[PDB]
């Protein structure tokens, strides 16, 4: 299993470059994710 | 109980794999049958956290590159997969899920100023992954309906 190559249509192949281009959303998860200080031993 | 993790560190055959369980049957299945061989093929790079002073893994995630392409014949878009990831059941609570997920960007991001890399994908089997991946930063995609993005910006 594992799905490593996704192949779409032209349509939504369009809309993911349109939102991979877009500005960067859920900057508040994503500062979150920054903020994040592991204690690893 | 206060519970100390070693660092992400790449599988290895010394790590003992049995007593991992995340409640999930699939990733706790491949964590044992798929992640050793994913490793010595070079198609994946697991990296486990221990109980400090042990080998006895209690969280993993996996990275894999991947491409979205259209329809014909950048023609891929260069993508990393976040696969998998993991924590196990006795030890919830404690924020290795998240240090874990911000182990993984993390690398991800440095990795992205070796090659090109333009986000991380998820896919999230259930609502409380896809809950914690968008506490995180992951969006929904439009190339899968359990698929969510991380984007990665320029260098720095
Ligand atoms: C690609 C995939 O594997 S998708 C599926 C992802 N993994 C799984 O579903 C495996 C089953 N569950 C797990 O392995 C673990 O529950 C994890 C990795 C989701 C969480 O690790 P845990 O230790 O449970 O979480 P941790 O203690 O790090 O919690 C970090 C924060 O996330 C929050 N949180 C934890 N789980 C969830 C959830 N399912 N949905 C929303 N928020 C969550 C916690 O409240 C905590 O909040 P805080 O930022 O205020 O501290």
């Known amino acids: ?5 996704f192949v779409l249509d032209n349509e939504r192949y369009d809309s993911f470059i349109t939102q991979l281009e877009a ?3 859920n900057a508040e998860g994503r500062e979150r994710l920054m903020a994040v200080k592991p204690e690893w031993k | 109980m ?9 599988l290895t055959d010394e790590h003992i ?10 990733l706790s299945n491949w964590l044992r049958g798929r992640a050793m061989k994913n490793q010595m093929l ?9 109980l400090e002073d042990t080998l006895r893994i209690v969280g993993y995630y996996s990275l894999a590159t991947g491409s979205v392409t259209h329809a014909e014949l950048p023609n891929p878009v260069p993508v990393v997969l976040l696969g998998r990831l993991a924590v196990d059941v006795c ?3 404690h924020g290795f899920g998240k240090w874990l997920l911000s182990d ?8 992205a100023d ?10 999230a089997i259930d609502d409380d992954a896809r809950a914690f991946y968008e506490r995180f930063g992951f969006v929904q995609s439009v190339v899968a309906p359990n698929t969510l993005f991380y984007k990665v910006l320029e260098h720095h």
Not at chain 2, 104 to 111: G, S
Request: aromatic share 4%; proline share 5%.
């Open chain 2, 104 to 111: 993984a960007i993390h690398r991800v991001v440095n990795l």
């Open chain 1, 23 to 25: 500005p960067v959303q």
């Open chain 2, 114 to 123: 070796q090659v090109g890399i333009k986000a991380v994908m998820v896919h």
């Open chain 1, 1 to 5: 299993a594992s799905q490593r190559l």
């Open chain 2, 17 to 26: 794999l049995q007593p991992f369980d995340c409640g999930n049957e699939v």
């Open chain 2, 91 to 93: 030890t919830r609570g």
């Open chain 2, 42 to 50: 070079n198609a994946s790079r697991t990296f486990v956290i221990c």
């Open chain 2, 2 to 10: 206060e519970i100390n993790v070693t660092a992400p560190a790449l």
